[PDB]
């Protein structure tokens, strides 16, 4: 998975010990002790899997670590467990109702593991002999590290091998039941033992994936095209009852996951009303909601609310609150960011960055590191010194300074009333 550097690449975990007590700086996370402790409690609840339909609200001031906390929870939760992260603005679609979009998001975060035991023969082919009707007579020889035997083919196997046009001397894989043939290069690699092996393959799917697969004749393309449409509720009921029966039979297990809505303050009252009931039912994942606004008017309503959310939903949620950082934590977060971005800052440069971040914003100081690095490279210098950061500060403006400039020159910008003085004279 090759990709560039993001703003959350350094957070490789939640940084807890055995007793769920977070360390001062571990797994890329700094500070936020109580928030990380509560996030570890949530993570343990997710791993247990015995608790369903819990909503946790991650509230606090901006640039405090809500998305960082969610990313740490996701990484510590690891793979092999669903984690759906959708912004609140992704629900509003022209093809799916908001309730249907929320339902699909809810189903995406509940995983189902199905084990399929397949009999497949793997080895290095040697000879193939196919003859005309005397329907068809055929013999193939497969060599491995310790066996070399011939196989008497039948009609359909001969047809399949002719369709694949398998050559000789190339590693081949044939499935006894399905009949699929997977080609491989000449034996770096080599056959490793018995001709016919018994290895199980596990398929990880979500409830939404099963719903879409059964939705149409070839619905599994919609998982990529996105033209699923509002699935009939009877189909979902069928999926649910069959998943219950499979779990009872023991031929499939359920892996509950986490659904993360980053900007819940954009969902309307209908979405919250739907969420209230969707949480109650079984197969409901754990919903993490991140909000920042203190008291705002819920979208679709004309009244204020304690977080931009209706009181019914807040009654159903437990709130994890994040607190603003101080100078030392800003310093160590910037050091981690600089190490991630492969930038060697000096001590005085780091101190200047820390004071700038405390005065203005942590994100502003975080973004200045790469610009400072590029400025230094223009001077053919390796380490970023104070003057490079000062030039970066002079060239690029923050929110407060930009606001001050706009306020002091309000005539030359377009205002809310649509007035501007383009003419430099008069």
């Amino acid at each position: 998975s090759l990709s560039l550097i993001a703003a959350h690449s350094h957070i490789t975990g939640l940084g807890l010990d055995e007793n769920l007590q977070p360390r001062p700086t571990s797994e890329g996370m700094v500070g936020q002790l109580q928030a990380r402790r509560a996030a570890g409690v949530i993570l343990k609840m997710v791993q247990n899997g015995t608790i369903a339909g819990r909503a946790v609200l991650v509230a606090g001031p901006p640039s405090t670590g809500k998305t960082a906390l969610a990313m740490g929870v996701s990484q510590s939760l690891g793979k092999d467990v669903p984690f759906t992260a959708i912004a609140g603005s992704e629900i509003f679609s022209l093809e799916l109702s908001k309730t249907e979009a929320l339902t699909q998001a809810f189903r995406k975060s509940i995983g189902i593991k199905i084990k399929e035991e397949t009999e497949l023969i793997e080895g290095e082919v040697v000879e193939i002999q196919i003859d005309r009707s005397i329907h068809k007579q055929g013999k193939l020889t497969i060599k491995t590290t310790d066996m070399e035997t011939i196989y008497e083919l039948g009609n359909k196997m001969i047809d399949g091998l002719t369709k694949e046009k398998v050559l000789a001397g190339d590693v081949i894989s044939i499935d006894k039941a399905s009949g699929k043939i997977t080609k491989l290069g000449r034996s770096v690699q080599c056959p490793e033992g018995e001709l016919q092996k018994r290895k199980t393959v596990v398929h990880t799917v979500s409830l939404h994936e099963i719903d879409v697969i059964n939705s149409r004749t070839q619905g599994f393309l919609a998982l990529f095209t996105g033209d699923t449409g509002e699935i009939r509720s009877e189909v979902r009921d069928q999926i649910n009852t069959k998943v219950a029966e499979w779990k009872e039979e023991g031929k499939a297990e359920i892996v509950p996951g986490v659904l993360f809505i980053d900007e819940v303050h954009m969902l309307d009252i209908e979405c919250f009303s739907f969420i209230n009931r969707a949480l109650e039912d079984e197969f409901a994942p754990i919903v993490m909601m991140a909000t920042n606004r203190g008291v705002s008017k819920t979208r679709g309503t004309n009244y204020k609310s304690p977080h931009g959310l209706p009181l019914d939903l807040l009654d159903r949620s437990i709130i994890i609150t994040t607190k603003s950082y101080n100078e030392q934590e800003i310093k160590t977060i910037l050091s981690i960011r600089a190490q991630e971005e492969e930038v060697e800052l000096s001590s005085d440069a780091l101190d200047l960055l820390t004071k700038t971040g405390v005065e203005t914003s942590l994100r502003y100081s975080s973004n200045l590191i790469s610009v400072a690095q590029q400025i230094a490279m223009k001077r053919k210098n390796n380490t970023v010194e104070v003057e490079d950061v000062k030039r970066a500060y002079l060239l690029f403006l923050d929110s407060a300074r930009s606001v001050k400039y706009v306020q002091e020159n309000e005539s030359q910008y377009i205002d809310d009333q649509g007035n501007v003085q383009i003419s430099i004279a008069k």
């Binding site: 679609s93 095209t225 377009i414």
Partner: protein
């Protein structure tokens, strides 16, 4: 011979090796600090390291923001993908605004790949069906002959191209495309009048193999893996005339495409060229687009999005009580670095008018150019810029090449400014 546009004189940022900007180079006059900042941004883009970085070109109208964006595009070069946009372009009717924004995000990320093309071409000497059945075709050339076995899709393509014996075809093995290039020259004199357009017999061997490097975007791969896109078969025609409209591509398809691209890069057959997404007039965006842009910038594979606005203390569209520095909510502002763009004095206006006149192949007298500069100072710089063409037309109608003061006065009396028209309305 050549046409002139708003930014035809902008050939680059005009920055030297050390990074300092000359007063007049690359068609730019003044704006030294913004040019230096944009040069730093260009260096950051050329580094090909960070993802999701965003900057804001903030200034009044007619100040040089779009010119700076086009200069950044010129400096980066045609290799990199630079996607121009307007805030009004994201309000689609087929798919939601979020999908359009994501598609433009992935359109600005470039990929350069190497592919080997297997090509067959020659005069047909046999068309024998194997019996929907394979066709056995014999291709002759000036250097040799060859007999091939083609799949039923290629047979359908040949059948619908009306290819007979003596025709010259062109089969591309990778894509299965068949083109009938004409009839062989040996049969030119068979009849004195027929619609057939004759071509010479191909030179070289029938089987040709070449290696071509082609530039694609991630959006191209997503579209390829989402919907059928080409073909001469009726099956492809029905597949693409079915589900014709745009679809909401899912995150799963993007993740799988990213895995494919990572495999291609790891094998060394492909290289990545991250580019720039330019969104002009960002104040037209609604609060939902900004909210999703907050999440989209945190993606580990994102371009260096540049935003431009000319508004100050304006309320954000969609919201009713959020006053923001440039129509951009504070959540996104913290993710941005602001490059301030400053107005122009009289001397720089004069030089800009002079250079614009030089570009459009006009001759302006010094006194007339001084009058044009002072009226641009009085009313508007762009107003002075658009007055040049009517002045040249008036001068030509009087059998005079160079523009004189009288022609400028006549053009002023014919075409009016916003202030003069409003005064007439009053």
């Amino acid at each position: 011979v050549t046409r002139t546009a708003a930014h035809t004189h902008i050939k680059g940022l005009g920055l030297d090796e050390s990074g300092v900007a000359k007063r007049v180079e690359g068609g730019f006059v003044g704006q030294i600090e913004a040019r230096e900042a944009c040069g730093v941004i260009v260096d950051l883009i050329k580094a090909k390291k960070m993802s999701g970085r965003a900057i804001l070109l903030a200034g009044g109208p007619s100040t040089g923001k779009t010119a700076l964006a086009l200069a950044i595009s010129q400096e980066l070069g045609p290799k990199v993908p630079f996607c121009p946009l307007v805030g009004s372009e994201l309000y689609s009717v087929e798919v939601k605004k979020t999908e359009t924004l994501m598609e433009n995000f992935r359109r600005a990320i470039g990929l350069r790949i190497k592919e080997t093309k297997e090509v067959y071409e020659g005069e047909v000497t046999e068309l024998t069906p194997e019996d929907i059945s394979h066709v056995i075709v014999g291709l002759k050339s000036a250097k040799g002959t060859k007999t091939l076995r083609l799949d039923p899709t290629i047979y359908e393509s040949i059948q619908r191209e009306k290819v007979s014996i003596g025709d010259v075809i062109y089969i591309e093995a990778n894509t299965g495309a068949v083109k009938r290039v004409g009839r062989s020259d040996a049969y030119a004199t068979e009849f004195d009048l027929e619609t057939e357009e004759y071509v010479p017999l191909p030179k070289g061997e029938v089987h040709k193999k070449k290696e071509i490097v082609q530039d694609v975007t991630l959006h191209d791969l997503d579209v390829a893996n989402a919907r059928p896109q080409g073909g001469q078969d009726v099956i492809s025609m029905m597949g693409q005339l079915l589900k014709p409209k745009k679809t909401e591509i899912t995150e799963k398809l993007r993740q799988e495409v990213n895995k494919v691209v990572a495999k291609y890069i790891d094998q060394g057959v492909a290289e990545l060229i991250p580019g720039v997404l330019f969104i002009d007039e960002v104040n037209m965006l609604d609060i939902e687009i900004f909210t999703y842009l907050n999440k989209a910038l945190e993606s580990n594979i994102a371009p260096v999005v540049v935003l431009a606005s000319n508004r100050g203390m304006t309320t954000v569209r969609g919201t009713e009580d959020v006053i923001s520095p440039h129509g951009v909510p504070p959540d996104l502002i913290d993710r941005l670095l602001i490059v301030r763009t400053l107005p122009y004095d009289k001397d720089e206006i004069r030089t800009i008018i002079e250079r614009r006149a030089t570009v459009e192949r006009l001759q302006v007298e010094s006194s007339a150019l001084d009058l044009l500069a002072t009226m641009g100072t009085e009313t508007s710089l762009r107003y002075a810029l658009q007055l040049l063409a009517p002045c040249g037309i008036l001068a030509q109608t009087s059998n005079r090449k160079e523009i004189v003061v009288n022609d400028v006065n006549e053009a002023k009396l014919l075409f009016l400014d916003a202030k003069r028209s409003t005064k007439i309305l009053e």
